[PDB]
């Protein structure tokens, strides 16, 4: 099956905070895509690629943060837009969107 | 207007990347740092900053080595934030032109 | 710091329809930033304040179910500015109409966080 | 649907007595995700709008003075004032917002002895 699709919901801008990466995932000509977990629950799913999508020229930015938070298990805010739909992970409880931004969450700038 | 503001014995507490309204062919780089010994409530304890990159030129431009760097090992560092302001996370944020490490108490009053 | 506006009328006549308009001054009604949404309240003299109809960031208008099909609400994005109009007016709809502006939520996007900031209130005494 | 109800529409007052205004609902108003059950606190002095001043059950808004506190779950809330003053004993409201047909309560006055 295609794991890319276009359910065709429109730009805005949504974000899930608090959460952390883990379980990556890639593919050949496809996706960095991670889990984002929370309280021992997953929360959403995104990915990068820089070969199809139209955020493609930032993933070389994402992939070198990501990693960072892989790196390290920091607490983050991620943001995802919702125009594209990701199957990309097996049997998920969770579905998997378009990563557009990290941000490594400030309490005091209120981001986790 | 607002203009270049010189902020003095910072350290970047939190990094952040997001997409450029205005074209998909730069995406700013955002921060949040904080001064050395301000209080919790002064604004300059909180203060967000962003710079662009440019995503037609692949790489990492010297100002992205240098704040990986500086977050990495939380050193003090004298920005020149301003003029313009970008939105991020929802408030006004000065744009990055020029930042360099602290030395001492002569650069960094 | 947020403010919103009221610019309204006072003395709007039954089987009309009113406008109140929120200027907004210090948060973003865009599809780029992400949780802002924009509520209206009412409050009847005496009565306690009920809850009209607020709109999202990414136009998703969420209604009363009582007085739904009644009731519009639109904005202009850009012009930080956000209409609310409501049709078939009755003298018991005499309220302060206030409008709000729902502060985004601290753990989803999809998620539900209080009027922290509200606006001033408008009259309306749909009289006769 | 969530039919929020609050406790004494009428409480007398002295100034220092420590004020109890509780507030139940139909439904729960604890989500899952966040582990935080959505209710806020709101005042209102005489012409004024309504001004937060607890959310998520017991987190104090910003600004508001450390005398208002919340506790409670479920389905039973409290708000207590551990320190009355001359300016709040006004009207104050039980908002949900955990689905969103939002829903406020009846509202309580406090009045003096």
């Known amino acids: 099956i295609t794991t890319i699709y276009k359910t065709g919901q429109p730009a805005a801008d949504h974000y899930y905070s608090k959460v952390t990466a883990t379980r990556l995932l890639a593919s050949t000509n496809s996706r960095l895509c991670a889990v984002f977990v929370r309280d021992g629950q997953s929360v959403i799913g995104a990915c990068a690629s820089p070969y199809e999508g139209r955020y493609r020229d930032m993933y070389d930015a994402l992939r070198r943060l990501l990693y960072m938070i892989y790196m390290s298990g920091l607490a983050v805010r991620v943001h995802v837009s919702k125009e594209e739909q990701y199957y990309d992970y097996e049997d998920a409880t969770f579905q998997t969107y378009a990563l557009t931004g990290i941000s490594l969450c400030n309490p005091a700038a209120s981001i986790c | 207007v607002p203009y270049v503001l010189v902020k003095t014995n910072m350290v970047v507490t939190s990094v952040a990347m997001k997409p450029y309204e205005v074209t998909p062919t730069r995406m700013l780089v955002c921060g949040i740092a904080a001064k050395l010994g301000a209080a919790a409530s002064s604004p300059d304890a909180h203060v967000p900053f962003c710079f662009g990159k440019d995503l037609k030129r692949p790489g990492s431009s010297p100002m992205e080595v240098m704040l990986r760097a500086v977050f990495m090992q939380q050193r003090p560092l004298r920005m020149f934030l301003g003029p313009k302001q970008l939105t991020f996370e929802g408030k006004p944020a000065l744009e990055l032109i020029r930042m360099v490490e602290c030395s001492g108490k002569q650069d960094c009053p | 710091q947020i403010t919103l506006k009221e610019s309204g009328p006072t003395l709007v006549k039954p089987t009309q329809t009113l406008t109140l308009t929120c200027t907004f001054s210090?948060?973003?009604?865009?599809?780029?930033?992400?949780?802002?949404?924009v509520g209206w309240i009412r409050q009847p003299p005496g009565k306690a304040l009920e809850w009209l109809a607020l709109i999202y960031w990414d136009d998703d208008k969420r209604y009363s179910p009582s007085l739904q099909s009644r009731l519009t609400i639109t904005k202009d994005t850009s012009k930080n500015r956000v209409v609310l109009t409501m049709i078939n007016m009755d003298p018991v709809d005499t309220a302060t109409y206030y409008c709000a502006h729902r502060r985004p939520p601290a753990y989803d996007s999809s998620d539900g966080d209080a009027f922290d900031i509200w606006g001033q209130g408008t009259m309306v005494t749909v009289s006769s | 649907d969530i039919v929020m109800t609050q406790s004494p529409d009428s409480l007398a007052v002295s100034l220092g007595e420590r004020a109890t205004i509780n507030c139940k609902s139909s439904?729960?108003?604890?989500?899952?995700?966040?582990?935080?059950?959505?209710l806020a606190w709101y005042q209102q002095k005489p012409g004024q709008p309504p001004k937060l001043l607890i959310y998520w059950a017991s987190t104090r808004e910003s600004g508001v003075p450390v005398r208002f506190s919340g506790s409670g779950s479920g389905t039973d809330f409290t708000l207590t004032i551990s320190s009355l003053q001359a300016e709040d004993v006004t009207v104050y409201y039980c908002?949900?917002?955990?689905?969103?047909?939002?829903?406020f309560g009846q509202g309580t006055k406090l009045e003096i002895k």
């Open positions: 439904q729960s108003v604890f989500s899952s995700s966040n582990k935080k059950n959505n």
């Open positions: 908002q949900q917002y955990y689905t969103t047909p939002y829903t």
């Open positions: 210090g948060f973003s009604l865009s599809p780029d930033i992400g949780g802002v949404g």
